[PDB]
Design a protein around this ligand. Sequence first.
Ligand SMILES: Nc1nc2c(ncn2[C@@H]2O[C@H](COP(=O)(O)OP(=O)(O)OP(=O)(O)O)[C@@H](O)[C@H]2O)c(=O)[nH]1
Ligand SMILES: [Br-]
Ligand SMILES: [Br-]
Ligand SMILES: [Br-]
Ligand SMILES: [Mg+2]
Length: 175
Amino acid sequence: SMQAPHKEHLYKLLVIGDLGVGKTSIIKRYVHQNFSSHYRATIGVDFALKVLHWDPETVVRLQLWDIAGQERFGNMTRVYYREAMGAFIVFDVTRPATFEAVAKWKNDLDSKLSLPNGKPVSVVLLANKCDQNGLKMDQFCKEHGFVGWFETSAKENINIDEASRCLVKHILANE
Ligand SMILES: Nc1nc2c(ncn2[C@@H]2O[C@H](COP(=O)(O)OP(=O)(O)OP(=O)(O)O)[C@@H](O)[C@H]2O)c(=O)[nH]1
Ligand SMILES: [Br-]
Ligand SMILES: [Br-]
Ligand SMILES: [Br-]
Ligand SMILES: [Mg+2]
């Protein structure tokens, strides 16, 4: 048979952002290679598993937590975030009110979760629905403690493989 991988990683990753920004769609594209325009609102939280053959020696398993957009108005997001090693925070480029919610989610996450060493977790910002300022997005990341941002489309499959690759790169880098 095949030589077993040298190393296998399992990481919990959060997907957060306000109602309808595309959290579920990004996960469905990334994991199941599919999209539909039909809005099925998440109730509480749903889960998916991405297997990355990271290198010939290395598997990375990503336990994706698809959190519903109104969960930040509840009382225990602290439980949702427990043991996560990274997050995507998503907004809808067509609805600027969802961009305002990004800092709300980021502040909620950073207040309730740190790595064992007390460091904040790696977070990438996804500017989603780009199928429907570069410097300013960079400045925003530096001001709010994001490692990166990408324009994404679950519909056209833009930059979702790249954003996830770059987030896992950062999570390994703190190891
Ligand atoms: N055009 C376009 N529509 C998108 C994209 N991503 C999501 N949508 C649509 O936007 C709507 C909301 O998508 P969801 O993935 O359910 O959003 P959500 O953030 O999971 O919503 P909640 O779970 O209710 O908080 C749906 O009608 C999707 O088809 C995208 O990249 N492009
Ligand atoms: Br539809
Ligand atoms: Br809301
Ligand atoms: Br809103
Ligand atoms: Mg959803």
